[PDB]
Design a protein around this ligand. Structure first.
Ligand code: A1IT3
Ligand code: A1IT3
Lengths: 257, 257
């Protein structure tokens, strides 16, 4: 009784951004999000173009790009359109509502102008969502709430995770899903994206902990895997991206029946 | 048995950044931090120069500055040195450790190059501190941990606040204090900075809640008030800044004895 991505795209209460994402996931047979954690625009754009066909989403940290310009994001949008993926700026908004409005819309980055999706921490209360929504809703954008984290010592557990789910439910015109390690909402309209994913077990020296695609998608019920170093540090990023795509997509299919 | 700012500056376990801050607070008789939430470099630099003598710290959001350049931060450093205040970039780092390293050091903003202090959320676990420390410690910088928030619905309460205090204790070579609404640590080496401060009662429409200087400093035991709109929206920002300085400084003095 679990709906395919394609069916989820047609759900009555689905956000237009999620519906576009779910349709291209189904069409392209990819539930992989590339975490393009690179410091040079040329590498960001070469990864986006080569791996574009293999991904449903490209997750950015534009505040690490040494040569950021708006023209770089224009070229990135051209590739997102060509290859059909969404752009997700992983900014983790977590300030008071009044402040996040200007961070999302303005400054040098003008995130709301090119980011299909942003994410936000729920620790400040619902004002963080309300502030972002004042910019994002008129621009037809979506937001993800951070309901759990993959890093050691995370405090996003128990009642904190529950607060994030309730917050999402109550703001469904803008909040389209979660960053979590597992399915945290029983409503199929919400997307679940899981970072801290690698084919092999382990972590890093700065608190990151990894789980496999089959575990996160197949057993823990998430929709999309967010993968950075497992792809970016490989020699052949395209075959690495294809390996992760096949793992996550088959895990999804075997969960469907 | 409460030590003056001047004495706290000499405590054996005090961080060099906190000691410099505590000395200038004492010398200038100001425990006021100006939240310079403006979008134009000219207004940021005109506020820093005119209110510099009245402040112990200028808190920035460089990601809302429409015309940010590194030369703007050079001119801001010239004013911080001239007038003797610290610069605090209110970035609220809250990502995995590996990611925050590059956000703090690199990108367009090169925050670590000009920010005496940054702050960080504790929700990801201690990896956020460890990541920032790898850049900040070699540069002799300090970090503040967000132990409580002033916004409605905040989840930074109870065991979350306690986790932030423990995290600070265990990283005292880099963590110099807290963003909180009250004294949360009994160790005088740590600084307590409190936002959500205005002379009059009220809030905003996006979740902000205000308390007075006398309440935050005098009754709740914080060290420094962080004030934005109560100064920036006033016609005469200098007299507004002087009003807040006198409130916070007298409240401190009456707490001493
Ligand atoms: O809870 C989270 C939330 C976000 N991320 C992001 O996902 C990417 C993973 O990068 P990787 O380890 O190289 O695969 C990084 O950009 C970080 S901030 C997490 O990791 N955990
Ligand atoms: O828990 C917090 C942490 C930080 N701040 C920041 O302090 C400033 C207050 O701005 P004001 O309302 O205009 O005085 C803003 O930049 C916000 S992000 C809080 O408010 N609460």
């Amino acid at each position: 009784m679990e709906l395919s991505f394609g069916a989820r795209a047609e759900l009555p209460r689905i956000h237009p951004v999620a519906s576009k994402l779910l349709r291209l996931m189904q069409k392209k047979e990819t539930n992989l999000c590339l975490s393009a954690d690179v410091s040079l625009a040329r590498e960001l754009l070469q990864l986006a173009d080569a791996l574009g066909p293999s991904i449903c989403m490209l997750k950015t940290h534009v505040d690490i790009l040494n040569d950021f310009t708006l023209d770089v994001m224009k070229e990135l949008i051209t590739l997102a359109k060509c290859h059909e993926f969404l752009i997700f700026e992983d900014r983790k908004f977590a300030d008071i509502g009044n402040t996040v409005k200007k961070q999302y819309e303005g400054g040098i980055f003008k995130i709301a102008s090119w980011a299909d999706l942003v994410n936000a921490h729920v620790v400040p209360g619902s004002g963080v969502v309300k502030g972002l929504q004042e910019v994002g809703l008129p621009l037809h954008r979506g937001c993800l709430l951070i309901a759990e984290m993959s890093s050691t010592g995370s405090l996003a557990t128990g009642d904190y995770t529950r607060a994030a789910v309730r917050m999402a439910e109550e703001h469904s015109e803008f909040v389209v899903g979660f960053i979590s390690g597992s399915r945290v909402s029983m409503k199929p309209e919400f997307l679940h994206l899981t970072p801290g994913v690698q084919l092999e077990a382990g972590g890093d020296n700065l608190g990151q902990q990894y789980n496999s695609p089959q575990e996160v998608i197949g057993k823990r019920g998430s929709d999309i895997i967010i993968v950075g170093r497992g792809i970016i540090s490989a020699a052949d990023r395209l075959e690495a991206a294809e390996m992760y795509r096949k793992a996550a997509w088959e895990a999804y299919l075997s969960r469907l029946g």
